[PDB]
Structures are given as structure tokens and as C-alpha cells.
Amino acid sequence: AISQERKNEIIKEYRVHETDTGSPEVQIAVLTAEINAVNEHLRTHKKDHHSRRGLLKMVGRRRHLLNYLRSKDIQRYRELIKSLGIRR
Amino acid sequence: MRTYEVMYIVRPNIEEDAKKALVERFNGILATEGAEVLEAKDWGKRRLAYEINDFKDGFYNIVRVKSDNNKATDEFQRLAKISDDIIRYMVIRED
Amino acid sequence: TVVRKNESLEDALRRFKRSVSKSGTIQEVRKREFYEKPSVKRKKKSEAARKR
Amino acid sequence: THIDYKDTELLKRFISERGKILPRRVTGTSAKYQRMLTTAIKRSRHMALLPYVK
Amino acid sequence: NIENGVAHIRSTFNNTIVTITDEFGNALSWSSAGALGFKGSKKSTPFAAQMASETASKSAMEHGLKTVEVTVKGPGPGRESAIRALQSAGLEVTAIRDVTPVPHNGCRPPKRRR
RNA sequence: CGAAGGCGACUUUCUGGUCUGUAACUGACGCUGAUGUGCGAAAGCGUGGGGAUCAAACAGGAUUAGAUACCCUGGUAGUCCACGCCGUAAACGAUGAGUGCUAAGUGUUAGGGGGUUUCCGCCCCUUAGUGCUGCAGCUAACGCAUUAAGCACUCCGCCUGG
Known about the structure:
Chain E: One of its GO terms (molecular function) is structural constituent of ribosome. Chain E: This is Small ribosomal subunit protein uS11. Chain E: Belongs to the universal ribosomal protein uS11 family. This is part of a larger assembly, with chains A, B, C, D and E. Helix content of chain A is 47%, strand content 0%. Chain A is mostly helical. The N and C termini of chain A lie far apart (31 Å). Chain D contains 3 helices and no strands. Chain E is mainly β. Chain E is built from 1 helix and 4 strands. Chain E has a two-stranded antiparallel ribbon with strand order 1-2. In chain E, strands 3-4 form a two-stranded parallel ribbon. In chain E, strand 1 (6-10) and strand 2 form a beta hairpin. Chain E is globular. In chain E, 43% of the residues are buried. Classes of the chains: A mainly alpha, B alpha+beta, C mainly alpha, D mainly alpha, E mainly beta. The C-E interface holds C 1-5, 7-10, 12-13, 15-16, 19-20, 29-34 and E 69, 79-81, 83-84, 86-87, 92-99, 102, 105, 109, 111-114. Chain A binds one RNA strand through residues 2, 17, 19-26, 38, 41-42, 44-51, 53-54, 61, 64-65, 67-69, 71-72.
């Protein structure tokens, strides 16, 4: 699916835009779960190996979209990086 | 998801009681926590195709699982060849 | 695995031949012994359904 | 799917005690039917229906 | 003690050698490719057992093998007429067991049949 | 399919990603290029194996009017896998990677829409490609081309004597 296990378990706090499919502001801080969760997506039988660069240019995707919001408005990414629990 | 479809045959140089001591597990214990041997998929006298167990006919009781969790297939992949009515297994993760 | 009787043995030229080749998985027999190169067979190794 | 061990009912024409598969054109199939023929039968065909070699 | 003997034939493309043995491993004797003047692996000729293996079999006279059952693990030209020394004195060639192994396959390789 | 070197036993994995049918959707959020990314095959490469196979050396043979060589078993290592790789191949696309076409065609893997459903097949649309040709263009010609050795918008690097 739209991975409602996480993609729409995190929307409970991160559905900041409706038709939240696609509005990149929705997928704000979903990068936090895939640290060791994708290591278990791989390590069972191993090599989702380039998923490292995958997740890390996904952090880059956050740089692509959350800064697109910062340009849409600074207070947006401030609310998402100052008052948010993933700070700075 | 480690869904293990375990090709197990019984050591068919056995009696129905020796089958019973190990296939009483493969209906209820293999129904533990989404393991779901879907029913008594332990058919009678089949034909041993490649000859194992030094017995010339096949009593093919086999454990069949279509799930995602698949709890209690390891509980006889560990009892695979130690058994007197299992021989082998199949190590298969199937999400 | 083969028992053929009722045949002459100067005529065993014809009796020793006909239980050899029949197998669709003649390769998936061979598995773990002696493994080779398709080099000149790369003319014919773009081939059906192996993994592509 | 990955047809299971007894799931060779309409396919034991393809299965064998001793090692005979029908490749793609042998059944006239495309790259999903031939693919189950060559991969999904194998859970029934290989593990305790084919002695590969010693 | 008659009707007991196998001509277990270790014949490749060359090396037409055959043990005139029991049905299982006890190995009476033979006219093999090291027996009728040859050595083996150029004896792609039956004269290991073209005529002079039933010389051995009837000098024995204990087999009485109506079933002599040449057991092969490869090809060979003189092997189809390595059984002519089971037809010479006439020990009733009855089986041709030309097979290579299919037990199963020990480990990160040792090795066995192709 | 991979960053490539390249990627091959299969039950399985992640099916990651290709992949086409849907694509459910905020508003330029990309190619090449400071960053940085990794390795690249072998010859050779830092441990047990390794002379088990193969194998240089040696033996030993000799063509016809010529070896120890084409010849190689014993065999020198080496070969080889459980701990370190080089930045080299005709890795050649001699042809760098973004937006899109160049009459187009072409049968086809995938995934689809389907009619007919067949007896899982005939017919139409289909694209990443798959090939085949083939319009324009291309250079001297080799020859390239709806998938360049063309055409109009991106970057890269190269060199205008060697």
C-alpha cells in the first residue's frame, strides 16, 4: 500500500496537508524510522545495500522539499524544525 | 516476512503412532500465531521420488503455510532430521 | 538402473545406447560437480527465461 | 504465485520423479507462466522430488 | 552356489576394464584391461572381456550367472563386447546398468556425479 | 539488474530498483558539474590450503633430412577459497551524461486497456526497451539514425599540428 504501517501511522501528527498523498509537507519527519528498520529490511537476507545512499539522499529529499517549504514560508520549516521534536 | 513453506517428509519407515507423535504438532502447534497449517495437509501413502530414509515408499506428510508471520515452522525445522517422522525442511523467507 | 535382456552382444552395439539423454532438467541433475563456460555459446546466451 | 508441494495437480505433467522440465516453447507460455513453471514448481519438484546429483 | 556374480564394468570412453565380482563388493577376479595384454585407457577394445573373461568365469564355475549384469559408469567401445566374454562361454547377459551416481551431495564441495 | 569491474545452480530474500495500467497529489523542488560515492577484471595482489586438477621449469620423446618446443603425467610455484585490491582490458559506444522529435515502420520480453475470450489463443492501442530496417539529417566514406555518427533548448570535458 501507501505504507500505512508507517507512511500513514505518522500522518496522525504529520498530515499537515490534505490529499496528503503528494503534498511533500505531509512526509515531514518520517525519515526517523528507517535507521535500523531498513537494516532489517535488508539484514535478514542481506543486500538492500545501496539503500544506504537511498535513505541518505532521502534525507536529501527532505532537504529538497522542507527547504522548498522554507522558501514557501520560513515559519513553516521553523514550526517543523524549531518547535518540532526533530530540532535543528 | 519469514514465511517458511517447509517441505518436510516423514521418515516413512514408520508406524502411524510415530507419525502421530509428530503430526499432532503440525495441525495445532503449526496453527500457533498465524503459522496456520491450513488443515491436515498430511496426506497418506505418496511415492518417495528421490529415495531417502532408506524406505522405498513415501508417506508424504508435509507442512504447508501461506501467511506472513509464520511462527511455529522453525519449531520443526529444528526438529527436521532429529525427528522420527520428519526428514528435511526448506529455508524460505516469503514476504 | 536398467536391465535389458534378450539381445546379442556383438549386437550390443545397438543395446548400449537408448537410456541416456531423456531429461528436461538434464542440467538440473548435474548440479554440484563440474561447471563450465558459455563462451562460444554466447552466440546463444541471451536466451529465454533464466532470470530475464 | 509460489505453488506449493501438492500444488502440482495440473502440473505433474511437468513434474518428474527424475528430472524433466518443459521449457518455455514446450508449453507455449509467456514470461509469467513459464516462470512459474521454472521457479514455482521447484518447491514441489526439487526438494524431495529430484535427486540432483551426489 | 550358482547364479551369483556381477561383471561390474569400470569402462570409460577408454579403459574397458571389468571386475568379475560378486553381486556386491567381494571381487573374485577378472579379465580386465590389465589382464589380456593391455594396461587400460587405450584399451577401447573388448579384449579385456571379448573372450577371456568367461575364461575366468568358467575357470571359476561358481557364479553360474544367468544374470551377469555389467554395471557401467561411463561409455566405452569394448564394453558392449566386454560382454562377449559373458557370451563366449555363455553366461546369459541379462542387464546393462549404465548409470552415474545420484545420491546427494555432501557439502561445500567434496564432489560427486555431474 | 548494478556505481562500475560487471551481474548465473536453483526453494526462498530485498524484491530493493527496472516495469507498464492506475497513477490517489504540494508547487521547479533536476542533468551535468566544487563537494563527496564506491569499487573495477584479471597478470599481479598482503594468511592455511596450493603442486588435488591445470602448470610453466626440468624429465622424456621424436617427425622427415630437426628440441627441452606444438606434447605433457611426477612435478617448481602459481592456479584456488575462509583475512587486503589495485584504479589498468577490444571495460570499444574509438562515439560523455538532461528537454524532445527525425515518414516511420517493425515482430517482440515486461506490464496494461481490451474485443474475440480463445482453448489462455486470433485482432487493435501500448510504451522502458527488443531487435530489424527505414524518412530527414550525418561525415570523405566508412557508415550512423524514432534507441546516433541528425535535429532545436542542459552541462561536462577534449583538443584546433602532431
